[PDB]
Amino acid sequence: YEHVTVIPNTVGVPYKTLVNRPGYSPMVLEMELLSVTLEPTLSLDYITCEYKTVIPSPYVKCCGTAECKDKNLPDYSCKVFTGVYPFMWGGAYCFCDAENTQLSEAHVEKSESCKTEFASAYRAHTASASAKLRVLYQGNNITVTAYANGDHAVTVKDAKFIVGPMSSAWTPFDNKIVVYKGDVYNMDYPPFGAGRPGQFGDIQSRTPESKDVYANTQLVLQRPAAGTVHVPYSQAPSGFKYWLKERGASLQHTAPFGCQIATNPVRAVNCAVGNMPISIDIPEAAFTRVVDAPSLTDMSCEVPACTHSSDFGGVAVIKYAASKKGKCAVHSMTNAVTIREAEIEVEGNSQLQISFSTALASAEFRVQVCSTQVHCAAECHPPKDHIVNYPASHTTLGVQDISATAMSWVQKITGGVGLVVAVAALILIVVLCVSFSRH
Amino acid sequence: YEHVTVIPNTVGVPYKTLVNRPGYSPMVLEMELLSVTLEPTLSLDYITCEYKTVIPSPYVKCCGTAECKDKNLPDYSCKVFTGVYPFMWGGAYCFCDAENTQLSEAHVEKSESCKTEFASAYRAHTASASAKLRVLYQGNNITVTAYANGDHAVTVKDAKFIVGPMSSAWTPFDNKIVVYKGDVYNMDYPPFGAGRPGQFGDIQSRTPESKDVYANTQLVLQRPAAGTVHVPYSQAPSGFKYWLKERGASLQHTAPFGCQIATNPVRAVNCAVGNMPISIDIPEAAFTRVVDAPSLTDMSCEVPACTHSSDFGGVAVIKYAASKKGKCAVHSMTNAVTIREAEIEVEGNSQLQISFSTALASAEFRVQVCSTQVHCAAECHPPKDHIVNYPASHTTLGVQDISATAMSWVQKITGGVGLVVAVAALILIVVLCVSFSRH
Amino acid sequence: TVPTEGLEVTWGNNEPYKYWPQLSTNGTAHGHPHEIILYYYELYPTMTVVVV
Numbered sequence: 001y002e003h004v005t006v007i008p009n010t011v012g013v014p015y016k017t018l019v020n021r022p023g024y025s026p027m028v029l030e031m032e033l034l035s036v037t038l039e040p041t042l043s044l045d046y047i048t049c050e051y052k053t054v055i056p057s058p059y060v061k062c063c064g065t066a067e068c069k070d071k072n073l074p075d076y077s078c079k080v081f082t083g084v085y086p087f088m089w090g091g092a093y094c095f096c097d098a099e100n101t102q103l104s105e106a107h108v109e110k111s112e113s114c115k116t117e118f119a120s121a122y123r124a125h126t127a128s129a130s131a132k133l134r135v136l137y138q139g140n141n142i143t144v145t146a147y148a149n150g151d152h153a154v155t156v157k158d159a160k161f162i163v164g165p166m167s168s169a170w171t172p173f174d175n176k177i178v179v180y181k182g183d184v185y186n187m188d189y190p191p192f193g194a195g196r197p198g199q200f201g202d203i204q205s206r207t208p209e210s211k212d213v214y215a216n217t218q219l220v221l222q223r224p225a226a227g228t229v230h231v232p233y234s235q236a237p238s239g240f241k242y243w244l245k246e247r248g249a250s251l252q253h254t255a256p257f258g259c260q261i262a263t264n265p266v267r268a269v270n271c272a273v274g275n276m277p278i279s280i281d282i283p284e285a286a287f288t289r290v291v292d293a294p295s296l297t298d299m300s301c302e303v304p305a306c307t308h309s310s311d312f313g314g315v316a317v318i319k320y321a322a323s324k325k326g327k328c329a330v331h332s333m334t335n336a337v338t339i340r341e342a343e344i345e346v347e348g349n350s351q352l353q354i355s356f357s358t359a360l361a362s363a364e365f366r367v368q369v370c371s372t373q374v375h376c377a378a379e380c381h382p383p384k385d386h387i388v389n390y391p392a393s394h395t396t397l398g399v400q401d402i403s404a405t406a407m408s409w410v411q412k413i414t415g416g417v418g419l420v421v422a423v424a425a426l427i428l429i430v431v432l433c434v435s436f437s438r439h
Numbered sequence: 440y441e442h443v444t445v446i447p448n449t450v451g452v453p454y455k456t457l458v459n460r461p462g463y464s465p466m467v468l469e470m471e472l473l474s475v476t477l478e479p480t481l482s483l484d485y486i487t488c489e490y491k492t493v494i495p496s497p498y499v500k501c502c503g504t505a506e507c508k509d510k511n512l513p514d515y516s517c518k519v520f521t522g523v524y525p526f527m528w529g530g531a532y533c534f535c536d537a538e539n540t541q542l543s544e545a546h547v548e549k550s551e552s553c554k555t556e557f558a559s560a561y562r563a564h565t566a567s568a569s570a571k572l573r574v575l576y577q578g579n580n581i582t583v584t585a586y587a588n589g590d591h592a593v594t595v596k597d598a599k600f601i602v603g604p605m606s607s608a609w610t611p612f613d614n615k616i617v618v619y620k621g622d623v624y625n626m627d628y629p630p631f632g633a634g635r636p637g638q639f640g641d642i643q644s645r646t647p648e649s650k651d652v653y654a655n656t657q658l659v660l661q662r663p664a665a666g667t668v669h670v671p672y673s674q675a676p677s678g679f680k681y682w683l684k685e686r687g688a689s690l691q692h693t694a695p696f697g698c699q700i701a702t703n704p705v706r707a708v709n710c711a712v713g714n715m716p717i718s719i720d721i722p723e724a725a726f727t728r729v730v731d732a733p734s735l736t737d738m739s740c741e742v743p744a745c746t747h748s749s750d751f752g753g754v755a756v757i758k759y760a761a762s763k764k765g766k767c768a769v770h771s772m773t774n775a776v777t778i779r780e781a782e783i784e785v786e787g788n789s790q791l792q793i794s795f796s797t798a799l800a801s802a803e804f805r806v807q808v809c810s811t812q813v814h815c816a817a818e819c820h821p822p823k824d825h826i827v828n829y830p831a832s833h834t835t836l837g838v839q840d841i842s843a844t845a846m847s848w849v850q851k852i853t854g855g856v857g858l859v860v861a862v863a864a865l866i867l868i869v870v871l872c873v874s875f876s877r878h
Numbered sequence: 879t880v881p882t883e884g885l886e887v888t889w890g891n892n893e894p895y896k897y898w899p900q901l902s903t904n905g906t907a908h909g910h911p912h913e914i915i916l917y918y919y920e921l922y923p924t925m926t927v928v929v930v
């Protein structure tokens with residue numbers, strides 16, 4: 001028997017479904033999503049890191065003009081300065097005094113620290129959602145890990161599970177992301193080979209060990225100070241460091257729907273968005289015929305306490321007279337209230353206690369214990385605590401549901417006013433009928 | 440200078456674009472797509488291959504009933520046959536004449552050939568396009584390779600190229616593909632863990648070296664045949680082999696747009712769909728000032744022969760006054776006519792010869808050389824060959840706006856009919872004015 | 879301010895705290911009509927005024 005159901009994607013809240021196979025005792029399955037993971041498939045655009053400005057020792061031509069040659073180095077910059085009179089510690093460098101020239105050259109190489117301290121600019125396309133699901137099957141807790149794309153069959157205890165396809169394709173990642181250590185950022189990094197100085201991606205490389213390096217740091221050489229041999233340069237500082245000091249907040253702190261963002265591999269975990277179709281193929285061995293299950297007659301419901309505290313505040317005590325000892329699956333007949341217990345052992349003439357959570361002002365509902373139903377009505381009070389640390393176990397309620405004795409009141413008011421309207425209609429109709437008799 | 444243009448996404452057909460910088464001699468660039476590759480990002484769903492049935496020796500118990508336990512083997516099937524009287528070469532094996540039992544057990548495991556002969560069921564999400572482009576830059580013929588997703592700006596000879604993004608996201612691969620060796624098939628393979636006997640995917644595993652094998656071959660043990668010691672079995676044959684013998688044509692032969700398909704990695708080479716934006720950052724040193732470029736006068740055009748076929752069936756001869764010796768680009772002032780050559784050397788008072796292709800029955804176009812234009816007129820004859828083995832080089836077929844010469848027949852007919860209508864309208868207006876002018 | 883969907887607060891390096899509001903009110907849902915409308919307003923302050 002194949003049973004198809006839909007469960008909200010919220011993590012940690014169990015939902016119960018009634019598998020009703022005619023000719024067999026009803027079965028109740030409680031399923032809870034322990035973990036839902038969206039792992040996007042990443043195509044690495046490039047690697048950014050800190051650059052290193054390599055400046056070899058300057059050349060000093062004592063009497064004459066030096067010249068340099070262009071090179072294929074990533075950001076090679078050369079310049080010759082005339083009229084330099086550099087000094088070493090022992091005095092003037094050489095005899096010729098004003099004709100001296102200084103050849104100064106520099107370039108940029110991606111640092112060795114690029115192997116460990118780097119940011120990876122990726123593109124993300126789609127997520128292969130996977131789910132860990134806890135199912136209360138045959139009174140035992142079983143765990144199934146299955147891809148949520150609707151195309152993974154997981155068989156446990158001869159029972160087959162198909163999970164997915166998830167309704168909502170929303171993912172916290174956009175097309176282009178940046179990963180650094182354990183932090184994931186959603187930013188539009190500049191295209192490869194067109195980076196800008198002083199910002200993110202000024203120096204770029206396809207892989208951390210790649211030997212090609214696109215670097216744009218505006219490395220401009222300046223005139224050395226008089227009487228010195230240093231090589232000054234004006235350069236936009238490493239944009240990777242500026243980004244690090246000004247990263248902002250990562251995705252795990254700003255993602256919507258409470259998603260938890262992780263790295264290695266990049267994952268989005270527990271996004272409470274959309275819902276999950278679940279299809280369960282259950283073998284015949286798990287079902288019990290109605291004639292073998294207990295038959296319950298003369299059953300009544302009482303509600304000693306009810307508070308809509310989102311923590312199963314209501315309690316129901318039901319008196320039953322069972323045909324014989326056994327177990328039977330208790331299930332609520334309405335969507336407004338949810339029963340914590342999935343099944344109860346029953347024997348003889350006794351009473352059973354269940355705990356339910358609701359949001360109704362008056363908990364009027366029906367409970368299907370074995371194959372019969374019993375009606376419960378309750379006077380439910382609001383809880384005293386304002387805030388709790390767990391999501392509500394009860395479901396959201398519609399307009400007519402919460403109405404309770406206010407509904408009892410609007411019944412009186414509407415009845416009276418509509419009775420006035422009906423009396424007016426009768427008077428108008430009889431007056432019109434009399435009027436047409438006078439011609 | 441930034442020049443943005445659009446070229447149709449075809450391979451082997453060069454296109455001419457005109458870079459017009461005011462104050463500079465016009466430049467013409469010939470771009471040709473050598474290879475456009477669509478590489479979908481694949482996530483391996485699973486591996487299928489030929490199964491091997493392992494059958495241990497049957498257990499013959501003479502004077503007792505054999506019993507076997509359930510085993511966690513992938514498709515373990517075990518049975519006991521009573522009343523067997525097996526024979527070996529030297530005579531009866533079992534002394535007890537009756538009541539003897541044979542215990543027959545067998546299971547399924549993926550064979551060693553799964554490391555070499557296997558089919559990979561993949562999921563395809565989105566392709567990262569790449570393009571190889573040949574550019575006619577400064578009289579040199581250069582080649583540039585770049586991703587075609589509006590990214591990967593690539594600099595060659597100081598010229599910066601930005602390729603794409605693709606105008607169409609069409610890809611020949613469906614969501615699910617199957618790769619065997621070099622043939623990929625658009626097949627909706629069964630979901631993992633839910634294979635069917637005798638079809639593709641009856642035995643599945645996540646990766647070729649995985650020990651996790653899901654096998655569904657409905658292996659059923661049958662009774663041994665009358666005194667033999669064999670263990671017969673009835674099993675659906677390898678669905679992988681049946682798929683091999685029934686593969687059909689792969690995507691390499693059935694894909695539209697003339698796409699070619701390759702594997703390792705999976706690529707869709709040369710898909711002629713949509714168009715391609717190209718952005719070029721030409722260095723200022725590339726351009727030549729108008730004063731230094733030749734200025735042509737006394738320029739006239741004639742056509743020795745024209746055949747409105749592919750492969751440049753038209754030839755034109757143009758006479759010019761070159762003024763200063765030099766070279767300059769040649770461009771067509773209308774799209775329906777395409778000139779093969781891009782630049783021409785002009786000197787003295789010689790004449791130049793150009794080759795052009797068109798679908799026009801009557802060539803009526805203008806040619807721009809060295810910033811001055813000529814009007815070329817020709818009557819073009821239809822070709823003799825019905826079919827050629829190369830794509831059309833002219834831009835396209837004519838539209839209703841462009842007929843041939845001797846369209847003056849249409850002008851004469853329209854003029855005569857409209858003149859009759861106009862004189863009739865004049866007579867009608869005069870008569871109406873006379874009628875309204877009464878009284 | 880904790881909305882209906884819940885609020886997640888990260889304080890320093892501590893593990894984030896999660897808060898959800900529950901249906902607390904100073905009115906009563908089975909008393910006099912003014913207490914009724916007070917309860918029914920306090921729980922859903924937006925569309926109760928619309929329906930009333």
Ligand SMILES: *[C@@H]1O[C@H](CO)[C@@H](O[C@@H]2O[C@H](CO)[C@@H](O[C@@H]3O[C@H](CO)[C@@H](O)[C@H](O[C@H]4O[C@H](CO)[C@@H](O)[C@H](O)[C@@H]4O[C@@H]4O[C@H](CO)[C@@H](O)[C@H](O)[C@H]4NC(C)=O)[C@@H]3O)[C@H](O)[C@H]2NC(C)=O)[C@H](O)[C@H]1NC(C)=O
Pocket residue numbers: 042043044115116120181207208209263264
């Ligand atoms: C301290 O700790 C940090 C954090 O872990 C370490 O950083 C890690 O460094 C590793 C070594 O570089 C990184 O691992 C790999 O390095 C490879 C070097 O060549 C690199 O190529 C890898 O990237 C490929 O593989 C990834 C995983 O499969 C893919 O996600 C990625 O996209 C690359 O895959 C290619 O993608 C292109 C896309 O165009 C395809 O065309 C190719 O076909 C793909 N090839 C393959 C084989 O898939 C990868 O980076 C590791 O990533 C990195 N950590 C993080 C979080 O990124 C420091 O090294 C460590 N310190 C020291 C001293 O070790």
Ligand SMILES: *[C@@H]1O[C@H](CO)[C@@H](O[C@@H]2O[C@H](CO)[C@@H](O[C@@H]3O[C@H](CO)[C@@H](O)[C@H](O[C@H]4O[C@H](CO)[C@@H](O)[C@H](O)[C@@H]4O[C@@H]4O[C@H](CO)[C@@H](O)[C@H](O)[C@H]4NC(C)=O)[C@@H]3O)[C@H](O)[C@H]2NC(C)=O)[C@H](O)[C@H]1NC(C)=O
Pocket residue numbers: 041481482483554555559620645646647648702703
């Ligand atoms: C005879 O010749 C055939 C081919 O003609 C050879 O087949 C090749 O065999 C190789 C080794 O067996 C294959 O190479 C790899 O094998 C890995 C075995 O573990 C396999 O895991 C690899 O697949 C993963 O890695 C790739 C690159 O990193 C990814 O592109 C690929 O998608 C897989 O990546 C993840 O895989 C897991 C699997 O569960 C998924 O869950 C993830 O979602 C995947 N992530 C991503 C991002 O994709 C890889 O296949 C090689 O592929 C194979 N050839 C072909 C065409 O497939 C035989 O070996 C050879 N035999 C002999 C004896 O010579």
Ligand SMILES: *[C@@H]1O[C@H](CO[C@@H]2O[C@@H](C)[C@@H](O)[C@@H](O)[C@@H]2O)[C@@H](O[C@@H]2O[C@H](CO)[C@@H](O[C@@H]3O[C@H](CO)[C@@H](O)[C@H](O[C@H]4O[C@H](CO)[C@@H](O)[C@H](O)[C@@H]4O)[C@@H]3O)[C@H](O)[C@H]2NC(C)=O)[C@H](O)[C@H]1NC(C)=O
Pocket residue numbers: 453473573575578579580750
């Ligand atoms: C740009 O690059 C080409 C060479 O590149 C090669 O060809 C490209 C189309 C492309 O595929 C590249 O990947 C590849 O590497 C330079 O020259 C082109 O090719 C030949 C080279 O000799 C030129 O001349 C040709 O020579 C043939 C042999 O003499 C001759 O027969 C051709 O004329 C006739 O050929 C065909 C038969 O195939 C015939 O049917 C026609 O009627 C045609 O007249 C041809 O003249 C080509 O002209 C060049 N290609 C083009 C499209 O013009 C090229 O020089 C280089 N650019 C520069 C500035 O040098």
Ligand SMILES: *[C@@H]1O[C@H](CO)[C@@H](O[C@@H]2O[C@H](CO)[C@@H](O[C@@H]3O[C@H](CO[C@H]4O[C@H](CO)[C@@H](O)[C@H](O)[C@@H]4O)[C@@H](O)[C@H](O)[C@@H]3O)[C@H](O)[C@H]2NC(C)=O)[C@H](O)[C@H]1NC(C)=O
Pocket residue numbers: 902903904920
């Ligand atoms: C139901 O009735 C309750 C009591 O009548 C309400 O509780 C009161 O709610 C009001 C506003 O909602 C609060 O007023 C605020 O008070 C804070 C400071 O008070 C708090 O901090 C001091 C610090 O010394 C502490 O001594 C107090 O006891 C409070 O804990 C102000 O800064 C605000 O500006 C504002 O005035 C009352 O404080 C609060 N009192 C109590 C005892 O709870 C409750 O809100 C009502 N519920 C509903 C749904 O209406």
Ligand SMILES: *[C@@H]1O[C@H](CO[C@@H]2O[C@@H](C)[C@@H](O)[C@@H](O)[C@@H]2O)[C@@H](O[C@@H]2O[C@H](CO)[C@@H](O[C@@H]3O[C@H](CO)[C@@H](O)[C@H](O)[C@@H]3O)[C@H](O)[C@H]2NC(C)=O)[C@H](O)[C@H]1NC(C)=O
Pocket residue numbers: 014134139140141
């Ligand atoms: C099947 O599993 C459910 C819940 O799943 C469990 O949750 C984990 C935290 C672990 O406990 C795992 O064993 C398992 O995945 C079980 O229901 C849970 O049972 C526990 C103990 O039986 C309850 O803990 C108690 O909760 C009360 C509530 O007031 C506390 O006061 C106690 O101090 C104690 O912590 C827990 O509340 C309960 N949760 C739910 C939603 O019912 C279930 O018992 C289990 N069944 C079987 C047959 O294994």
Ligand SMILES: CC(C)CCC[C@@H](C)[C@H]1CC[C@H]2[C@@H]3CC=C4C[C@@H](O)CC[C@]4(C)[C@H]3CC[C@]12C
Pocket residue numbers: 396397398399400401402403406407409410911914915918922925926929930
């Ligand atoms: C006439 C007087 C005496 C009583 C009238 C009470 C009415 C106006 C009150 C009763 C409690 C209230 C409802 C209880 C539950 C729901 C469902 C929820 O999803 C939206 C709010 C909504 C719809 C409330 C709106 C206002 C409401 C209908």
